């Protein structure tokens, strides 16, 4: 009975996150970052909006999805580059 919509959002933040994810995937990484991982952010944001029974995806529900995706990407990297990757991606998870 819930189908949240992505009307209010900052597509620039998601685009920047996806570009950074791909750039760090090609160099010093092995997790494949395709467009599927761009759509995963939107799908996870919609699931988070479903949890609050909301009919519109809020900014918090998008920042949380971005944090989930970047965390899953970072934690699967080798321990040598994990600190650098976390430092690089910290600017998107500001607030938590």
């Amino acid at each position: 009975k819930i189908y949240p919509k992505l009307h209010q959002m900052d597509m620039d933040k998601v685009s920047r996150v996806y570009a950074d994810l791909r750039r760090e995937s090609i160099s010093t990484g092995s997790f494949p970052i395709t467009v599927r991982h761009l759509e995963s952010i939107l799908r996870i944001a919609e699931s988070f909006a479903k949890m609050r029974l909301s009919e519109f995806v809020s900014s918090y529900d998008l920042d949380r999805a971005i944090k989930v995706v970047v965390d899953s990407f970072v934690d699967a990297q080798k321990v040598s580059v994990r600190r650098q990757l976390r430092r690089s991606f910290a600017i998107y998870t500001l607030g938590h």
Partner: peptide
């Protein structure tokens, strides 16, 4: 001090009702 200044920039841009990563 990248992070603590990005937080300040986000708070400043909230005044203009602008998103942090807006073009």
């Amino acid at each position: 001090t990248i992070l603590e200044i990005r937080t300040l920039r986000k708070e400043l841009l909230k005044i203009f009702e602008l998103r942090e990563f807006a073009k």
